[PDB]
């Protein structure tokens, strides 16, 4: 499955640069990026992010520009939702670009 | 070419080391 | 007497988490029930003894296996063609096809082809026959036997060392510098001069005749007369063949530099001189500190006085002696940071300056060693930072460090964290943006629009070191400069040729791809440091949890109140930064492996062209070089790389299973285990068989640990296969 | 069992006790507070650690504070 | 000799670790 | 306040005259660090006696096979009279016999060596302890001191003979050219 | 002994029951050496030093490795594995009014020194086995040729 | 050295270090420190120049006296810091 389907048929995606399917190549990479970006939200937790925002808020307050709407790390449910959304978008876009580039090139 | 007696002698020293390892583990466990 | 005897709380714990947490806090000796400092130190000492014995047993096992089942003698005759054998395979699951495929290396039985370089190491060091390897294994076995007995002995009542002796810093540092580093390096230089240079020059020096054979024809008369240049006179010729007397010199201590032409490794005379000199330095430096004879230094006095004028660094280094000598976690963190930096240094230096004969042409071993040592360096760095955090949350005393150089770190931790965030953000934004610009430009059929920054500063360093293809003509590149002239009769006549020879990995040519990937490496290092430094500095407290030190180092959370407090403990900072350690080391190893595959294959204009965009990495490195691995076994048959393919998929599977513990958390699994408990208790027949520990879902920190474990093991398995099999299949 | 503590920044607003789902907390008379009452934890062995007291505490930082510790059947909240 | 892989690998990687797992389980389920 | 052996260095704090052969000889203070650690000099004294007694036996054996006949020579006739080469020429049978005997004897010794029993007099293994039944306390201490002196001398004697045989191949007034 | 209460409980270790069982096994083993020696003298075992094949004994054959596993070896292997199967059956299964391998809770190990005749013969048989193995090792000769 | 047996060398509240930091040279005057530092700088720079700048170093030309005198240049730095410390402490 890894060799004769993914590796074998990824050729038409990866070799698409400089051709009309180069948009599919770019979206392949971008969907990969978003799928990986999702793992930040999926694995991490609000406490670290709120403390990091506290450090950044100190940096802003030192310059007299900390906003009236105080910044907070995303809620726990929201972090899970954002991770899930990015994970689904990245995976689905990866498959989308892969299938479209492969099938348009060969068929 | 390593000989059978050589392998057996090394194995005997390894067994002595094993006994000492059990002893050290005991003494660290107490 | 229940399993966690060291922790009565887990002893009363009735669920299955008792076993997990007992195994997990087995070695957390500081927090055990009824523990004293003296007992802690003695137990640590005995465990160190056992650990050393393990190391030497591992070494003896490698030596014995190469002696017994390896083709060391055949490999010695033809190092560049015969493939080194690690050990024989004993597997009843092997078929006839796998048997025939794994039967290789000029032996009649299945074997594993060594990729650790131990063959090259021992051949360079002076081993020529299986008997020498077997005797080395025997002696290391005896050494481990003695170390185990020493560990047992140093827990006895009359032989239990005291806390004052343990905290005697000056004597320990004096002895480690002078003897553990210094005299041991002197011993290695003596070994080289007595056994390795003669064996390279075609002389069989062993225990029976090393006492009779003179390493130099003159003897020690030059050493005593002070005419030490006679030991450099008559160096090895450029036509020398390793292991033979033809073209062999008589010099034992030289500074020729460069590389040995036949083996493409540094001269053994150079290495012996290195170890001799370096030992002089270390044996001198080991007389720095005061130990029972008045003359010397006082580390507490040094730290106390080093406070700059007008209180620039607050109170200076006052109290740092007390904190370091009282807290073992700070010592552990310093040791781990130093050792991680050293591991990165050896990884960067072994490939650029090979020291073992014929290792440079062994492409699989070089990649395996670089990846191995870079990964261990990353782990050591993460551990150093984690133990710094544990020190801050457990052992830090602000009363002792009032207005200290260490307390000021906590004072402006907000500035530090914010600026690390800034630099990480800048690096990532710009590196990713330039990579995407290059991606889109090459994608749209116009690579000319790529933004390609020449790494002019690194190229300038290469020119100053001796490179000449850039044409900068600065320092050593300019033959005329003081730097080039002052060293023109010691090392430059060889180093210049070595660096400008294009057949070497010494100071590889660099380009825009190297610029971009180096900025990516900077992003990885900076973000890992951000996560780790933030964890260390916020371990004591935060605006969201000022009393974090009361909870300690590793606790699940503070609850959903105050908006949620997930991963707030500063252990979760380590667990987060581990992902970034893996990420940055993966980037480093991909860069190394692709650039070196291209250089070895002779098409550097594949890396220089494709590495500027990310699809080049995805295609000309991963996809292109994944064929010999994934074709290890297919529908038509199998090759000797089928083990690498199976382990590749194995690491993929473990990496994937880690996502389960990282994403799905305890409540789902707890309720599901309630359902399973109901089913087991209610079904007939099976309900006679009943557990003793109540089965519960894994704790939160436990599951974070398990998920990260599955991630890391996975990472290493996947790249090990891909780095060991693609290189073999491509060369 | 977990350790529940109450600090003298209590204002006697009696919300931790209402958030309590195990009857661990209870108001007792006190001279310090204006309301004349302070939360106290005489049944810490029944604590499970859900920290609803901490969530419901309105002080700038928590007057009622819970430290997780030795686990038990009650603390794990196992019906078996 | 070539005897010893057959004698030692299964003894050391089926029998001994199974006995160790049995011993560890029995020990941790004491008292 | 000052050592008796070296009358310009301080007396070792660990040594206090309550041991056989205590003449305050410890420039390094190995005993000092041992007692600071928490141990007691029983182990070092027993090691001294063991090393010494071995050294006396080995001193006589170094020169016996040359000065006097190397046994009736059923099997020893092949082995050289040089002690440094005789070690690398013992047959497997004899080597195993001697090694097994020594190993069993010292495995028996180890348990009493590393025991907590305070009754154990240092270097008192019971081998031929019947001649001290009639000795007085002064006689016992003096005889133990002669033993320790012989031990201390033989230890240096082996180093001298071994290095002389290795570098020169001959002991000067006694055995020559071997 | 005392430091190993777990194995001391069921007679596992330096115990009279263990010595009895090992003496019985040494008796049967000396019998077995004599029996297989006369078997090799006669014709029962396959001859020719024919190596096993993957088609008959699979990966346990080690057809192409080395180590010349023979059909006589396979047959005696089957015999000793059947001995080990009956062993597990007799040890773990019901003690057919004989001897338990384990001490059992109630029993205490017999006092250290017809049953005594068995133990004397067992000590003699263990000594004979060790002497034969040594004599083979020193001489370099085969065990069957040594006993012959 | 232990925690107890260690001199009070902290000087963050004062303008100059105590002279005790100089250890064995806690009493040698600032004049001696400065003169020795200057001679050490001159001699060491002379040795370094004669070894690697005026001449080209090599296996047959490395000079032990010049090598040893090179180590008087850092000693010169230490001696000049010492001269300042003793001048400020009044010795
Ligand atoms: C840690 C070092 C090490 C390693 C990784 C291995 C690995 C291996 N050995 Mg072993 N071996 C070693 C040291 C080691 N050996 C040493 C020093 C000797 C004595 C000279 C032997 C002698 C030996 C023989 C004779 C044989 C093997 C074989 C094997 C293979 C099967 C496993 C087996 O049963 O061996 C273990 C066998 C033993 C007799 C036990 C050796 C005891 C070692 C020294 C323990 C070291 C422990 C370690 C440091 C830490 C603890 C590990 C664990 C508890 C967590 C395998 C490749 C077999 C083979 O070739 O298969 C193809 C085989 O026939 N080995
Ligand atoms: C000269 C005397 C001496 C020597 C040789 C040692 C040696 C050692 N001590 Mg030390 N120690 C000494 C005096 C000495 N000690 C004294 C006087 C004290 C009391 C004041 C102590 C107190 C002490 C403690 C409390 C402990 C040690 C420990 C150790 C071990 C450190 C771990 C190790 O092996 O790292 C090996 C390190 C090296 C070989 C140095 C080189 C490292 C570089 C980076 C490697 C270079 C790589 C190279 C290219 C590889 C090529 C392949 C080591 C065996 C620890 C231990 O393990 O105890 C069992 C320990 O816990 N010592
Ligand atoms: C850094 C020190 C060092 C190291 C790592 C080695 C390593 C080696 N030497 Mg040795 N050697 C050394 C110093 C060292 N030597 C010195 C100073 C000399 C005197 C000139 C020699 C002279 C020498 C000879 C003549 C020979 C070796 C050989 C060897 C090999 C086998 C060693 C063995 O079996 O040890 C087993 C013993 C132990 C593990 C115990 C070591 C000592 C303990 C740890 C005490 C430490 C204090 C190995 C490559 C043999 C070989 O074949 O080389 C190619 C060989 O014949 N060495
Ligand atoms: C010199 C090295 C060194 C030493 C002496 C210590 C010592 C310690 N560390 Mg550790 N640590 C190190 C390196 C070191 N560390 C490194 C490199 C890291 C970075 C990864 C860490 C990160 C770290 C953290 C984050 C923490 C510690 C903690 C501790 C303490 C308790 C650990 C414990 O209970 O272990 C016993 C642990 C176990 C029995 C679990 C071992 C699981 C292994 C690693 C699994 C291996 C994978 C798998 C099974 C193999 C797959 C094979 C194939 C399929 C102890 C004082 C803890 C502490 O102090 O808490 C207060 C703590 O929280 N350390
Ligand atoms: C590809 C995956 C990925 C990406 C892109 C990031 C990105 C980031 N991580 Mg990391 N992170 C990851 C995986 C990833 N992480 C994983 C798996 C984990 C383990 C849980 C973590 C854990 C983690 C922690 C705990 C921390 C970070 C931090 C950071 C920052 C690092 C500096 C940087 O690059 O800033 C520059 C940012 C980028 C290169 C990407 C930004 C978005 C691009 C440029 C698009 C721009 C907007 C676009 C036009 C919108 C269109 C909408 C329609 C950044 C937010 C640290 C941080 O926040 O430092 C400030 C930090 O503390 N990460
Ligand atoms: C190779 C032949 C052989 C055979 C068939 C046996 C068989 C037996 N031995 Mg073993 N034993 C052997 C060689 C052998 N021994 C040798 C060479 C020694 C001397 C080191 C011992 C020393 C020994 C002891 C000390 C004990 C056994 C015990 C046993 C019994 C249980 C062992 C067990 O559970 O193993 C694991 C599966 C079993 C009847 C035990 C016994 O009888 O327990 C009641 C017991 O205590 N044996
Ligand atoms: C640049 C800023 C700076 C300012 C100071 C200030 C001070 N330092 Mg120094 N120090 C500095 C940097 C600085 N240090 C650095 C970077 C280090 C790390 C190496 C040190 C290490 C250090 C130590 C270890 C000590 C001081 C001490 C002192 C105090 C006395 C200085 C003096 O008079 O020395 C006088 C110096 C001399 C008279 C000459 C000796 C100096 C040379 C350089 C020695 C060279 C030895 C030689 C090369 C050895 C062989 C090399 C190799 C092969 C091993 C003073 C508070 C001393 C003190 O007691 O503080 C409490 C003290 O013990 N410092
Ligand atoms: C190095 C050198 C030289 C030298 C030298 C020197 C000074 C060497 C000195 C050697 C020395 C001083 C050697 C002591 C031996 C003691 C013995 C044999 C005691 C045995 C005692 C035994 C075997 C006792 C047995 C017992 O069972 C008996 C019989 C009775 C029982 O109740 C129990 C005991 C146990 C008591 C030369 C040669 C001068 C030349 C040149 O200068 C270079
Ligand atoms: C040194 C010393 C001590 C001592 C002592 C002494 C004198 C110890 C002597 C120990 C001794 C002499 C121990 C032999 C055991 C032999 C056994 C168990 C062999 C069984 C072998 C068996 C069961 C083999 C059987 C078979 O293979 C055979 C043969 C044929 C094959 O078809 C298959 C079978 C399985 C059927 C102490 C007391 C220990 C401590 C003290 O401080 C000092
Ligand atoms: C948190 C914490 C901690 C930790 C920490 C860490 C972990 C760190 C690390 C760190 C690191 C990891 C660092 C590094 C560094 C480095 C450096 C600083 C370098 C330098 C260099 C140089 C100076 C060089 C120079 C040169 C030469 C000499 C030659 C050639 C040229 C050049 C120029 C390059 C501790 C424990 C402390 C405690 C407290 C807290
Ligand atoms: C990265 C991250 C953050 C920090 C990320 C935040 C706050 C998102 C930032 C979104 C703003 C609106 C920026 C969007 C781009 C423009 C600059 C506006 C969390 O707050 C968090 C909380 C809980 C679980 C996981 C995480 C998590 O993974
Ligand atoms: S501060 Fe918390 S504990 Fe105090 S009265 Fe209010 S809710 Fe109750
Ligand atoms: S920690 Fe949980 S059980 Fe305890 S008082 Fe708060 S809500 Fe109730």
Of E5, E29, E31, the CB nearest to C88: E5
Q: Please enumerate in sequence order all residues whose Cβ is within 8 A of that of C190, keeping only pairs 6 or more positions apart, or say none.
A: none
DSSP secondary structure letters along G4-51: -HHHHHTT-SS-HHHHHHHHHHHHHHHHHHHHHHHHHHTT-S--TTPB
Instruction: Output the CA–CA distances (angstroms, integers) from residue G91 to E22, G99, G105, in the order listed.
Output: 18, 9, 15
Residues with CB under 6 A from ligand 3: C 125-127, 132, 135-136, 139-140, 143, 184, 187-188, 190-191, 194-195, 205-207, 210
Instruction: Output the CA–CA distances (angstroms, integers) from residue A75 to A39, A79, C565, G47, in the order listed.
Output: 16, 6, 9, 79
Q: Which of residues 34-73 of C touch F (CB under 8 A)?
A: none
Please report, in angstroms and rounded to a whole number, the separation of the first and last CA atoms in chain H. 28
DSSP secondary structure letters along C612-680: TSHHHHIIIIIIHHTHHHHTTEETTEE-TTHHHHHHHHHHHHHHHHHHHHHHS-HHHHHHHHHHHHHHH
Nearest CA to ligand 1 atom 53: C54
Nearest-CA distance C430 → chain A (Å): 15
Element (H, E) at C409: helix C405-411
Report how far ligand 8's centroid is from the alpha carbon of A18 (Å): 95
Helix (H, G, I), strand (E, B) or coil at C392: helix
Burial-class residue G32 by CB neighbours within 10 Å (0-12, 13-18, 19+).
middle
β-strand D3-6 against D64-67: which pairing, if any?
A: antiparallel
Nearest to C43 by CA among B21, B25, B20, E28: B25
**Across the strands, what pairs with C297?**
C289
Q: What is the dihedral of CA A94, A96, A98, A102, to 10 degrees?
A: 180
C614 in Cβ contact with C435 (< 8 Å): yes
Sign of CA dihedral C51, C53, C59, C61: negative
Q: How many residues does chain F have?
A: 178
Which chain C residues touch A23 with a CB distance below 8 Å? Answer: 443
Ordered alpha helix ranges (H), chain A: 8-9, 11-14, 22-43, 46-61, 76-106
Asked if E4 reaches chain C (Cβ–Cβ under 8 Å), the answer is no
- How far apart CA F70 and CA C317 sit, in angstroms, is 72
Instruction: Output the CA–CA distances (angstroms, integers) from residue D18 to C268, D2, D55, in the order listed.
Output: 79, 19, 12
C70 in Cβ contact with C86 (< 8 Å): yes
Nearest CA to ligand 2 atom 8: C180
Report how far ligand 1's centroid is from the alpha carbon of B15 (Å): 11
Instruction: Output the CA–CA distances (angstroms, integers) from residue C150 to C38, C146, G117, in the order listed.
Output: 18, 6, 45
C441 in Cβ contact with C450 (< 8 Å): yes
Q: What is the dihedral of CA C604, C610, C614, C619, to 10 degrees?
A: -90
Give the CA radius of gyration of chain H.
Answer: 17
Helix (H, G, I), strand (E, B) or coil at C111: strand
Determine if ligand 10 sits within 6 Å of the CB of residue C378: no
- How far apart CA F14 and CA F40 sit, in angstroms, is 9
Q: Do chains E and G touch (3 or more CB pairs under 8 A)?
A: yes
Nearest to D57 by CA among D38, D32, D29: D38
Q: Please enumerate in sequence order all residues whose Cβ is within 8 A of that of D59, keeping only pairs 6 or more positions apart, or say none.
A: D9, D10, D11
Contact C486 H6 (CB under 8 A): no
C115 in Cβ contact with C62 (< 8 Å): no
Report how far ligand 8's centroid is from the alpha carbon of F76 (Å): 23
- How far apart CA D63 and CA D46 sit, in angstroms, is 20
Q: Do chains F and C touch (3 or more CB pairs under 8 A)?
A: yes
- How far apart CA C228 and CA C24 sit, in angstroms, is 57
D49 in Cβ contact with C700 (< 8 Å): no
**Across the strands, what pairs with D27?**
D39
Instruction: Output the CA–CA distances (angstroms, integers) from residue C325 to C297, C328, C536, C540, in the order listed.
Output: 16, 7, 19, 21
- How far apart CA D13 and CA D27 sit, in angstroms, is 10
- How far apart CA H15 and CA F113 sit, in angstroms, is 61
Which chain C residues touch F166 with a CB distance below 8 Å? Answer: 211
- How far apart CA G37 and CA G40 sit, in angstroms, is 5
Nearest to H66 by CA among H81, H51, H87, H45: H51
Tokens of C214: 């003179």
Could you tell me how far CA C414 lies from the centroid of its own chain?
31
Nearest CA to ligand 4 atom 21: C383
Backbone angles phi and psi of D67, in degrees to 5: -110, 120
**Across the strands, what pairs with C694?**
C15
Instruction: Output the CA–CA distances (angstroms, integers) from residue F53 to C250, C378, F39, F107, F125, in the order listed.
Output: 46, 55, 24, 17, 13
b/e code G4-15 from CB counts within 10 Å (16+ = b): eeeebebbeeeb
Instruction: Output the CA–CA distances (angstroms, integers) from residue G108 to C231, G21, G112, in the order listed.
Output: 76, 16, 11
Centre a 10 Å sphere on the Cβ of residue C725 and count the other Cβ atoms it contains. 27
Helix (H, G, I), strand (E, B) or coil at C527: helix
C356 in Cβ contact with C346 (< 8 Å): no
Nearest to F93 by CA among F74, F110, F67, F106: F74
- How far apart CA C504 and CA C537 sit, in angstroms, is 44
b/e code C160-169 from CB counts within 10 Å (16+ = b): bbbeeebebb
Nearest-CA distance C61 → chain A (Å): 36
Longest pairwise C-alpha distance within chain B: 44
- How far apart CA G100 and CA G10 sit, in angstroms, is 10
Element (H, E) at C29: none
Ordered alpha helix ranges (H), C539-613: 548-551, 571-601, 604-610
Q: How many residues does chain D have?
A: 80
Backbone angles phi and psi of D3, in degrees to 5: -105, 120
- Look-up of token digits 């025939």: C100
Which chain D residues touch C674 with a CB distance below 8 Å? Answer: 79
G17 in Cβ contact with G110 (< 8 Å): yes
Q: Do chains H and C touch (3 or more CB pairs under 8 A)?
A: yes
Tokens of B6: 């050589």
Instruction: Output the CA–CA distances (angstroms, integers) from residue C606 to C271, C442, C600, F152, in the order listed.
Output: 36, 15, 12, 75
- How far apart CA C705 and CA C532 sit, in angstroms, is 17
- How far apart CA C583 and CA C585 sit, in angstroms, is 6
Ordered alpha helix ranges (H), D1-80: 16-19, 52-56, 73-76
Ordered alpha helix ranges (H), C312-327: 320-326
Instruction: Output the CA–CA distances (angstroms, integers) from residue F107 to C156, F44, F51, in the order listed.
Output: 18, 18, 16
Instruction: Output the CA–CA distances (angstroms, integers) from residue H1 to C282, C316, C321, F13, F38, in the order listed.
Output: 21, 21, 12, 18, 19
Helix (H, G, I), strand (E, B) or coil at C358: coil
**Across the strands, what pairs with C638?**
C633
| DSSP symbol at C103 | B
Backbone discontinuities in chain G, residue before each (C to N > 2.5 A): 113
- How far apart CA C457 and CA C596 sit, in angstroms, is 22
Helix (H, G, I), strand (E, B) or coil at C593: helix
Determine if ligand 2 sits within 6 Å of the CB of residue C49: yes
Angle, CA C564 vertex, CA C559 and CA C565 arms, to 5°: 70
Asked if E30 reaches chain G (Cβ–Cβ under 8 Å), the answer is no
Q: Is F21 left (phi over 0), alpha (psi -120 to 50) or beta?
A: left
Centre a 10 Å sphere on the Cβ of residue A92 and count the other Cβ atoms it contains. 13
Q: What is the dihedral of CA C150, C155, C159, C160, to 10 degrees?
A: 130
- How far apart CA C272 and CA C251 sit, in angstroms, is 11
Tokens of D35: 């309301």
Nearest to C588 by CA among C335, C376, C356, C384: C376
Tally the C-alpha atoms within 13 A of residue C650's C-alpha that lie toward its C-beta: 12
Residue D20, annotated as binding a ligand: yes
Residue A35, annotated as binding a ligand: no
- How far apart CA C378 and CA H43 sit, in angstroms, is 46
Helix (H, G, I), strand (E, B) or coil at C270: helix
Instruction: Output the CA–CA distances (angstroms, integers) from residue C238 to C68, C494, H58, in the order listed.
Output: 35, 10, 19
Element (H, E) at G136: helix G115-139
Q: Please enumerate in sequence order all residues whose Cβ is within 8 A of that of C339, keeping only pairs 6 or more positions apart, or say none.
A: C380
The resolution in Å comes to 3.1
Which chain G residues touch C108 with a CB distance below 8 Å? Answer: 64-66
- Look-up of token digits 């002076």: C126
G41 in Cβ contact with G133 (< 8 Å): no
Sign of CA dihedral D60, D65, D68, D74: negative
Nearest to C177 by CA among C289, C74, C76: C289
Tokens of G77: 């292997």
**Across the strands, what pairs with C289?**
C297
Technique used by the depositors: cryo-EM
Please report, in angstroms and rounded to a whole number, the separation of the first and last CA atoms in chain D. 17
- How far apart CA D30 and CA D14 sit, in angstroms, is 13
Of C1, C22, C90, the CB nearest to E30: C1
Tally the C-alpha atoms within 13 A of residue C267's C-alpha that lie toward its C-beta: 27
Q: Which pairs from G44-47 meet CB under 8 Å and 24+ separation? A: G45/G71, G45/G72, G45/G75, G45/G76, G46/G70, G46/G71, G46/G72, G46/G75, G47/G72
Q: How many residues does chain H have?
A: 91
Which residue of chain H is at minimal alpha-carbon distance from C167?
A: H2
Backbone discontinuities in chain E, residue before each (C to N > 2.5 A): none
Give the CA radius of gyration of chain E.
Answer: 13
H8 in Cβ contact with H16 (< 8 Å): no
Q: Please enumerate in sequence order all residues whose Cβ is within 8 A of that of F45, keeping only pairs 6 or more positions apart, or say none.
A: F19, F20, F122, F123
Which chain C residues touch F29 with a CB distance below 8 Å? Answer: 292
Which residue of chain E is at minimal alpha-carbon distance from G66?
A: E2
Tokens of C694: 């109540």
C572 in Cβ contact with A48 (< 8 Å): yes
Helix (H, G, I), strand (E, B) or coil at G137: helix
Instruction: Output the CA–CA distances (angstroms, integers) from residue F140 to F100, F144, F153, in the order listed.
Output: 33, 6, 20
Q: Please enumerate in sequence order all residues whose Cβ is within 8 A of that of C204, keeping only pairs 6 or more positions apart, or say none.
A: C128, C198
Burial-class residue C477 by CB neighbours within 10 Å (0-12, 13-18, 19+).
buried
β-strand D64-67 against C85-88: which pairing, if any?
A: unpaired
Helix (H, G, I), strand (E, B) or coil at C559: coil
C638 in Cβ contact with C101 (< 8 Å): yes
Helices C118-125 and C37-69 cross at an angle (nearest 10°) of 90
Nearest to C395 by CA among C549, C538, C625: C549
C286 in Cβ contact with C178 (< 8 Å): yes
C299 in Cβ contact with C169 (< 8 Å): yes
Ligand 1 atom with the shortest distance to the CA of C140: 17
B28 in Cβ contact with C159 (< 8 Å): no
Asked if C559 reaches chain A (Cβ–Cβ under 8 Å), the answer is no
Ligand 10 atom with the shortest distance to the CA of C332: 36
Q: Please enumerate in sequence order all residues whose Cβ is within 8 A of that of C319, keeping only pairs 6 or more positions apart, or say none.
A: C397, C400, C401, C402, C404, C406
C568 in Cβ contact with A47 (< 8 Å): yes
Centre a 10 Å sphere on the Cβ of residue F76 and count the other Cβ atoms it contains. 18
Helix, strand, coil distribution of chain E in percent, nearest 5: 85, 0, 15
Helix (H, G, I), strand (E, B) or coil at C173: helix
Asked if C46 reaches chain B (Cβ–Cβ under 8 Å), the answer is yes
A66 in Cβ contact with A60 (< 8 Å): yes
Q: Please enumerate in sequence order all residues whose Cβ is within 8 A of that of F103, keeping only pairs 6 or more positions apart, or say none.
A: none
């Amino acid at each position: 499955w890894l060799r004769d389907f993914l590796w074998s048929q990824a050729s038409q995606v990866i070799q698409s640069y400089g051709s009309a399917l180069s948009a599919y190549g770019i979206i392949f990479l971008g969907a990969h990026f978003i799928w990986a970006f999702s793992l930040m939200f999926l694995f991490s937790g609000r406490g670290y992010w709120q403390e990091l925002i506290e450090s950044v808020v100190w940096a802003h307050n030192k310059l007299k520009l900390a906003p009236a709407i105080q910044p907070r790390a995303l809620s726990i449910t929201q972090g899970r939702a954002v991770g899930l959304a990015h994970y689904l978008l990245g995976g689905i876009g990866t498959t989308w670009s892969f299938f479209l580039a492969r099938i348009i090139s060969v068929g | 070419m390593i000989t059978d007696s050589q392998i057996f002698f090394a194995l005997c020293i390894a067994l002595t080391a094993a006994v000492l390892a059990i002893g050290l583990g005991r003494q660290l466990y107490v | 007497t229940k399993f966690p005897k060291f922790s009565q709380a887990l002893a009363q714990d009735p669920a299955t988490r008792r076993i997990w947490y007992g195994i997990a806090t087995a070695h957390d000796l500081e927090s055990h029930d009824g523990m004293t400092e003296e007992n802690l130190y003695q137990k640590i000492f005995a465990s160190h003894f056992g650990h050393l014995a393990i190391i030497f047993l591992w070494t003896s096992g490698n030596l014995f296996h190469v002696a017994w089942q390896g083709n060391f003698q055949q490999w010695v005759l033809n190092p560049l063609k015969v493939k080194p054998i690690a050990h024989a395979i004993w597997d009843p699951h092997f078929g006839q096809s796998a048997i025939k495929a794994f039967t290789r290396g000029g032996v009649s039985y299945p074997v594993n082809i060594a990729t650790s370089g131990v063959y090259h190491w021992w051949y360079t060091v002076g081993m020529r026959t299986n008997e020498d390897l077997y005797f080395g294994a025997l002696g290391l076995l005896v050494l481990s036997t003695t170390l185990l007995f020493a560990g047992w002995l140093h827990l006895q009542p009359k032989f239990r060392p005291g806390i004052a002796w343990f905290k005697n810093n000056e004597s320990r540092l004096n002895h480690h510098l002078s003897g553990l580093f210094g005299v041991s390096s002197l011993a290695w230089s003596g070994h080289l001069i007595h056994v390795a240079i003669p064996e390279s020059r075609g002389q069989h020096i062993r225990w029976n005749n090393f006492t009779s054979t003179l390493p130099h024809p003159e003897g020690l008369t030059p050493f005593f007369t002070g005419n030490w240049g006679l030991y450099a006179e008559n160096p090895d010729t450029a036509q020398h063949i390793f292991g033979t007397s033809e073209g062999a010199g008589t010099a034992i201590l030289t500074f020729l530099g460069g590389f040995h032409p036949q083996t493409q490794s540094m001269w053994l005379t150079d290495i012996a001189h290195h170890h001799l000199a370096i030992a002089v330095v270390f044996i001198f430096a080991g007389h720095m500190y005061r130990t029972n004879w008045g003359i010397g230094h006082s580390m507490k006095e040094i730290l106390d006085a080093h406070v700059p004028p007008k209180g620039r660094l607050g109170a200076g280094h006052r109290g740092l002696f007390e904190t370091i000598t009282d807290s073992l976690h700070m010592q552990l963190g310093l040791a781990l940071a130093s050792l991680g930096v050293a591991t990165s240094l050896v990884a960067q230096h072994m490939y650029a300056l090979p020291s073992y004969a014929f290792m440079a042409k062994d492409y699989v071993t070089q990649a395996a060693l670089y990846t191995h040592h870079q990964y261990i360096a990353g782990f050591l760095m993460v551990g150093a930072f984690a133990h710094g955090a544990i020190f801050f949350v457990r052992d830090y005393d602000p009363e002792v460090n009032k207005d200290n150089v260490l307390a000021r770190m906590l004072q402006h931790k907000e500035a530090i964290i914010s600026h690390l965030s800034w630099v990480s953000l800048f690096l990532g934004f710009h590196t990713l943006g330039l990579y995407i610009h290059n991606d889109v430009c090459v994608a749209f059929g116009t690579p000319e629009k790529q933004i390609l920054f020449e790494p002019v500063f690194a190229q300038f360093i290469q020119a100053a070191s001796g490179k000449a293809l850039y044409g900068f003509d600065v320092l050593l590149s300019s033959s005329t400069s003081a730097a080039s002239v002052a060293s023109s009769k010691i090392w430059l006549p060889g180093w210049m040729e070595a660096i400008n020879s294009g057949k070497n990995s010494l100071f590889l040519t660099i380009g825009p791809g190297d610029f971009l990937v180096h900025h990516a490496i900077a992003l990885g290092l900076h973000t890992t440091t951000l996560i780790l430094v933030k964890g260390a500095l916020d371990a004591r407290g935060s605006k969201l949890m000022p009393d974090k030190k009361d909870f300690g180092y590793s606790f699940p959370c503070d609850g959903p109140g105050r908006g949620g407090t997930c991963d707030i403990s500063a252990w979760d900072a380590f667990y987060l930064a581990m992902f970034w350690m893996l990420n940055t080391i993966s980037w480093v190893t991909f860069y190394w492996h692709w650039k070196h595959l291209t250089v070895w294959g002779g098409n550097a204009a594949a890396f220089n062209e494709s590495s500027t965009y990310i699809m080049g990495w995805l295609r000309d490195y991963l996809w292109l070089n994944s064929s010999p691995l994934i074709n290890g076994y297919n529908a038509f048959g199998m090759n000797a790389q089928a083990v690498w393919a199976w382990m590749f998929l194995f690491g993929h599977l473990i990496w994937a299973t880690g996502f389960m513990f990282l994403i799905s958390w305890r409540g789902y699994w707890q309720e599901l285990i309630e359902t399973l408990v109901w089913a087991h208790e209610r079904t007939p027949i099976a309900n006679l068989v009943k557990w003793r520990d109540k089965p519960v879902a894994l704790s939160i920190v436990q599951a974070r640990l398990v998920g990260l474990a599955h991630f890391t093991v996975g990472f290493i398995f996947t790249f090990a296969p891909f780095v060991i099999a693609s290189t073999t299949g491509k060369f | 069992s977990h350790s529940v503590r109450v600090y003298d920044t209590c204002i006697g607003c009696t919300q931790c006790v209402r958030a309590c789902p195990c009857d661990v907390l209870e108001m007792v008379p006190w001279d310090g507070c204006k309301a004349g009452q302070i939360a106290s934890a005489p049944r810490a062995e029944d604590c499970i650690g859900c920290k609803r007291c901490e969530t419901a505490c309105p002080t700038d930082f928590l007057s009622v504070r819970v430290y997780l510790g030795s686990e038990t059947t009650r603390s794990l909240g196992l019906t078996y | 000799a070539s005897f010893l892989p057959s004698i030692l690998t299964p003894v050391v990687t089926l029998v001994f670790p199974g006995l160790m797992f049995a011993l560890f389980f029995v020990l941790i389920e004491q008292e | 306040e000052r050592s008796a052996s070296i009358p310009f260095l301080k007396k070792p704090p660990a040594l206090d005259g309550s041991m056989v052969g205590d003449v305050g000889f410890d420039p390094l203070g190995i005993s000092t660090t041992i007692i600071e650690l928490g141990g007691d000099l029983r182990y070092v004294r027993e090691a001294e006696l063991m090393h010494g007694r071995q050294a006396m036996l080995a001193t006589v054996g170094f020169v016996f096979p040359k000065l006097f006949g190397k046994l009736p020579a059923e099997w020893a006739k092949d082995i050289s009279l040089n002690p440094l080469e005789a070690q690398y020429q013992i047959p497997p049978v004899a080597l195993g016999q001697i090694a097994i005997s020594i190993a069993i004897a010292e495995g028996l010794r180890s348990r009493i060596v590393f025991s907590n029993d305070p009754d154990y007099v240092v270097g008192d293994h019971g081998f031929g302890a019947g001649m001290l039944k009639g000795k007085s306390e002064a006689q016992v201490k003096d005889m133990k001191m002669k033993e320790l002196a012989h031990c201390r001398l033989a230890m240096v004697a082996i180093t001298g003979m071994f290095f002389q045989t290795a570098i020169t191949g001959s002991l000067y007034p006694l055995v020559d050219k071997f | 002994a005392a430091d190993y209460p777990w194995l001391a409980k069921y007679g596992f270790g330096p115990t009279v029951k263990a010595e009895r069982w090992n003496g019985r096994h040494a008796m049967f083993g000396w019998l077995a050496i004599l029996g297989t020696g006369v078997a090799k003298s006669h014709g029962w075992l396959p001859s020719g030093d024919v190596a096993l094949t993957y088609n008959e004994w699979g990966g346990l054959a080690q057809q192409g490795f080395n180590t010349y596993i023979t059909n006589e070896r396979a047959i005696i292997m089957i015999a000793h594995v059947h001995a080990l199967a009956v062993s597990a059956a007799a040890a773990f299964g019901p003690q057919v009014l004989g001897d338990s391998l384990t001490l059992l809770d109630g029993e205490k190990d017999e006092d250290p020194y017809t049953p005594a005749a068995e133990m004397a013969n067992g000590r003699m048989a263990m000594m004979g086995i060790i002497a034969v193995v040594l004599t083979s090792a020193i001489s370099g000769k085969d065990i069957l040729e040594v006993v012959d | 050295v232990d925690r107890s047996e260690a001199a009070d060398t902290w000087w963050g509240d004062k303008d100059y270090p105590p002279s005790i930091v100089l250890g064995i040279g806690k009493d040698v005057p600032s004049s001696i420190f400065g003169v020795t530092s200057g001679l050490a700088f001159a001699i060491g720079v002379y040795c370094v120049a004669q070894s690697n700048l005026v001449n080209i170093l090599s296996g047959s030309t490395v000079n032990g006296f010049y090598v040893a005198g090179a180590l008087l240049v850092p000693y010169s730095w230490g001696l000049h810091v010492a001269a300042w410390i003793q001048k400020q402490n009044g010795k």
